Design a protein around this ligand. Structure first.
Ligand SMILES: *[C@@H]1O[C@H](CO)[C@@H](O)[C@H](O)[C@H]1NC(C)=O
Lengths: 49, 45
């Protein structure tokens, strides 16, 4: 077998029907980011004289 | 007072009430994704 995307040479056999040198690679990504913030403040003041 | 007799009465009363409530906050969210394919192994970079 001719050198395709590999070593110097390779040897096939009769039972093996084919060898391929077509390099196809895929990929996928799913990234997320978030933030939830809460801030509650309460105050009271009463004076009696 | 009438004439000996003398009478005097003084009354004073005050009240005060105050309330202050404040709440401020922010929440942000952002998501980004990607997908790709490449049709030797060096090209995988
Ligand atoms: C708030 O959200 C920002 C958005 O990028 C993030 O960087 C930060 O770490 C978050 N803070 C938190 C969750 O306390």
């Amino acid at each position: 077998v001719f050198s395709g995307d590999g070593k110097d040479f390779y040897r096939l056999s009769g039972n093996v029907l084919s060898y391929t040198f077509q390099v196809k690679i895929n990929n996928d990504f799913n990234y997320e980011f978030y933030n939830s913030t809460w801030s509650y403040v309460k105050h009271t003041s009463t004076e009696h004289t | 007072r009438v004439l000996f007799a003398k009478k005097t009465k003084v009354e004073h009363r005050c009240t005060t009430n105050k309330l202050s409530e404040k709440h401020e906050g922010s929440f942000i969210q952002g998501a980004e994704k990607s997908i790709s394919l490449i049709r030797s192994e060096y090209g995988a970079a």
